[PDB]
Amino acid sequence: MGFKCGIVGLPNVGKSTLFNALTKAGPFCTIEPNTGVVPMPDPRLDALAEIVKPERILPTTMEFVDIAGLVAGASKGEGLGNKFLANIRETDAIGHVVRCFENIDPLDDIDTINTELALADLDSCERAIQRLQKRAKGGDKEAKFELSVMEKILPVLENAGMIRSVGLDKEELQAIKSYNFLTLKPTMYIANVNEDGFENNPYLDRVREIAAKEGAVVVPVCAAIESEIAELDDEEKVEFLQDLGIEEPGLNRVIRAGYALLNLQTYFTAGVKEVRAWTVSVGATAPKAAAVIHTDFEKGFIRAEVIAYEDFIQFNGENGAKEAGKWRLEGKDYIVQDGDVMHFRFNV
Numbered sequence: 001m002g003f004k005c006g007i008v009g010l011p012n013v014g015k016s017t018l019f020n021a022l023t024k025a026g027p028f029c030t031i032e033p034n035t036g037v038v039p040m041p042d043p044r045l046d047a048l049a050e051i052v053k054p055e056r057i058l059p060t061t062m063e064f065v066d067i068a069g070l071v072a073g074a075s076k077g078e079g080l081g082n083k084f085l086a087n088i089r090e091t092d093a094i095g096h097v098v099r100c101f102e103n104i105d106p107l108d109d110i111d112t113i114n115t116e117l118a119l120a121d122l123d124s125c126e127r128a129i130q131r132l133q134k135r136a137k138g139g140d141k142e143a144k145f146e147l148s149v150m151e152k153i154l155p156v157l158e159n160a161g162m163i164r165s166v167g168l169d170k171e172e173l174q175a176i177k178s179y180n181f182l183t184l185k186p187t188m189y190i191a192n193v194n195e196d197g198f199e200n201n202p203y204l205d206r207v208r209e210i211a212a213k214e215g216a217v218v219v220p221v222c223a224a225i226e227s228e229i230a231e232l233d234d235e236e237k238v239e240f241l242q243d244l245g246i247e248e249p250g251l252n253r254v255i256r257a258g259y260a261l262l263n264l265q266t267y268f269t270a271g272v273k274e275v276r277a278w279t280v281s282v283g284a285t286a287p288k289a290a291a292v293i294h295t296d297f298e299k300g301f302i303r304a305e306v307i308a309y310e311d312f313i314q315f316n317g318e319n320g321a322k323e324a325g326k327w328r329l330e331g332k333d334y335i336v337q338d339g340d341v342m343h344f345r346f347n348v
Contacts, residue, residue, distance in 0.1 A: 001281050002092040005258040006067045007190070009097030010109055014192040014223035018097065019066040021223065021230040021251050027057040036064040040259060040266065040277060041252040044309060044339055048268060048275045051317050058276040060266060062259045065091055071112060075119035085120050089180055093261045094187040095254070100203040100220070101194045107210055110189075115160055117182040122157040124179055125150055146175045157183070165214055188217035188261045190254055195225040219257045221250045267340045269293075270312070280336060289336045290344040300346040304330045309339030 009015030019036070026034040039059040049057050069084035070077065078085050088094070096113065098106055129150045135143030149172050153163050163184040168176075176184075191207050198204070198220055211218045229237055229249050241247070259279075266277045267289055280289045286304035290297035307318065311326035318341075321327045336342070 001262055001264065003061075003262065003264075003279075004063045004065050004091040005093045005095050005262060006065045006088055006091035007095045007097060008067045008071075008088070008113055010071060010099065010112060013097050013099040013109075015066070015097045017223035017227040018190070018192065018221065018251075018254075019064070021226045021249075022064055022255075024230045025251075029058050031061060036066060037061050038064070038255060040279075041248070041255055042266065042277060043248075044266070044268070045275060045277060047313060048270050048341070051313070052270045052272070052275055054271065054273060054275045056274045058274055060277040060279045062255050062264075064095070064255075064258065067091075071116060074116040075123070078120070084116070085182065088117070088182055088185070092185065093258070094185045095190050095258050095261070096187050097190045097192055098207055100191040100201065100207060101197055102203075106203055106207045110207075110210065111160070114162065114183070118157050118160045118162065121163060121181050121183045122154075124181065125154050125157055128179065129154065145171075149175050162214070186261050186263075188219060188257055191218050191220045192223045193220055195222045197222055217257055217261065219254050221254055226251050265336070265338045267336055267338075267342050268309070268312075269343065270318070270341055284336050285332065286330055286334045286336060286342070286344070287332055289342065293344065297344060297346065301332065302345045302347070304334060305343040305345065306330045306334070307341040308337065309341060312341040 007015055007019055022036065022038060026036070026038045029039075031037055031039070038061060040062050042059060045057055045059055065087075067084065067087045069082050069087055071084060074082055074084035096110065098109060100106065129147060132143045132147040132150060136147050149168065152168070153166055156163065156166055161183075163181045164186065189207055189211055191204050193201060193204060204220060208218055210216075226249065229240060229251075232240065263282050264279050265282050266279060269276050269278065278289070278292055280292055286306075287297060287301040290301055290304065306328045307321045307326055311321045311324070312318070315321040315324045315326060318327070
């Protein structure tokens, strides 16, 4: 959708251990514009590879961005050259690291940052109201429509609330898109714990408590335990894992949780030459999905040949599934499903 999640956090909370784990680890694809770009870790790839035996395997990517600058008075601070807020502006969602062990209600911590986001949005909202008012006083119908949206979010921002928590409809969103409001960015909590934190943890519970209220995802990592795995060899690490019920780097969970947060889904193409993960927004039709591969699919699309991920696996590839009849022709309004194995036609 834009493809950036910004990692934010209070000064002593592991943001750093976590974003370095993420940077270390960034088949035959060379991605090298990577101030936080990583390959999506997706075990569907290898599972597909096992059936298909492709020469190459091409995951997709997730971009994370480590938000520079100081938090404590970001809103006032910006006039002084603080970039916390502008940095957040260049992203599409927010992964919000919360210290979830001792050395204080987690809410106070989370509030420290949300205050500064709401305060900046308030200032935007107030300044907009002044301009849009004078347009509307002059009969300007669009400006009356935006203003009325401003006037719904204003008192929410006055009270440190999030624009994302206001039930605005699509027309309403559409009209305020251009403000690039910070408190409208989707967010998930990255609850950072001790290598022994997952368990009976009053902190982590209170964060889950807080998230439940606003529909938010919470993803526990131990950035301690996570930063370890990260300065071992390619493979000189396997034996490190098993030692508990984490079957993979708990980091892979944060990568996938942020890919979701940006509303992204994967579909796959699979053949003897390659298995590739392809990114589209949730709810894309096949033609939108397809246009990701080539731009003439927009107009040129004829059909999608589609197998549900679960069938491709079960029936061992495309001739299996065909045999079992799980190989569908789908059309212009088919809504791509997570992990569909697709082949697109622009000829018979």
